[PDB]
């Protein structure tokens, strides 16, 4: 009973990282409804705070078990549990900033356990990340496809800026089950991540995400599966 995916699941997360050489750690806890595609988390900076950069570059690194999938697509990442999966991401921002991430996901004692390692580099001094001028992510579409025995996703991800401008990243992620799992074909995932509350210096932050997979081929019949 401590090794299955219930309709309500909690998670714990630890992140160690650096951005432009500034080392930090985060610990958090979350919860959500994996088959509905919804989740929330509360994150706390436990080393290196206050962070001298925008929280928003970290927020997408805190949970793909909580994606609502069509009934006729193998839910590769759910299927990988309890052992779980690993993911690796590269984000290329339009001003030369780069974020690379690796992550381990497992199911232990009835909760998901996430361990994240992050390296952000080359953010410019007069850009919005190092000056905390961002204001959350627009909804995204992640184009998923199998490749080389893993599941890949690509996103053109748009960060809102306080001045009404926008700031784009190109993102690629590899998601790989720890044991062999049947891979899906290509499909898309619609995602929206919100920061629902935070303290003044973003050392305590609450997030919400909704994510839903959809077929990208198959005509009307493959809609709303």
């Amino acid at each position: 009973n401590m090794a299955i995916i219930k309709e309500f699941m909690r998670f714990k997360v630890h992140m160690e990282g650096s951005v432009n050489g500034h080392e930090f750690e985060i610990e958090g806890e979350g919860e959500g409804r994996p088959y509905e595609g919804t989740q929330t988390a509360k994150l706390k900076v436990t080393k290196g705070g206050p962070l001298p950069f925008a929280w928003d570059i970290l927020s997408p690194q805190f949970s793909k078990a909580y994606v609502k999938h069509p009934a006729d697509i193998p839910d590769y990442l759910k299927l990988s549990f309890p052992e779980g999966f690993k993911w690796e991401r590269v984000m290329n921002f339009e001003d030369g900033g780069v974020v690379t991430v690796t992550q381990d996901s497992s199911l232990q004692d009835g909760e998901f356990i996430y361990k994240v390692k992050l390296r952000g580099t080359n953010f410019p001094s007069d850009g919005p990340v190092m000056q905390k001028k961002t204001m959350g992510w627009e909804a995204s579409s992640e184009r998923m496809y199998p490749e080389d025995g893993a599941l890949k996703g690509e996103i053109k991800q748009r960060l809102k800026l306080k001045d009404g401008g926008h700031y784009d990243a190109e993102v690629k992620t590899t998601y790989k089950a720890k044991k062999p799992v049947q891979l899906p074909g290509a499909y898309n995932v619609n995602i929206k991540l919100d920061i629902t509350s935070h303290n003044e210096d973003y050392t305590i932050v609450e997030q919400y995400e909704r994510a839903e997979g959809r077929h990208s081929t198959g005509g009307m019949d493959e809609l709303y599966k």
Partner: nanobody
Amino acid sequence: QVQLVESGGSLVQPGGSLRLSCAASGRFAESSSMGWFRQAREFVAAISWSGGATNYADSAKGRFTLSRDNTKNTVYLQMNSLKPDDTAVYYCAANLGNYISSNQRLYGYWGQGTQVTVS
């Protein structure tokens, strides 16, 4: 696609035992987690696609056992200590999301049912 074919329903005596089967076929049979529901629908027990996790409704725990032959994508529900009120049509259903709990709406593929009578 996943197709499910059940077998094994029979008449047994009170206190008796039976073994039901459900064979999954189709492109996603290897990824099919299978759950049994009975309709006199109510959850009975389920087993993950890998055969490695099982979950039993309260009334089934300790007297029923589920197993999976991964080479045939077939599951077996061994029912012991059966009583008249276990009489029902037993359905097996499947999902591709590693779900083995009681919400029937999370199983999108259904077998045809098999009749168990205890009397």
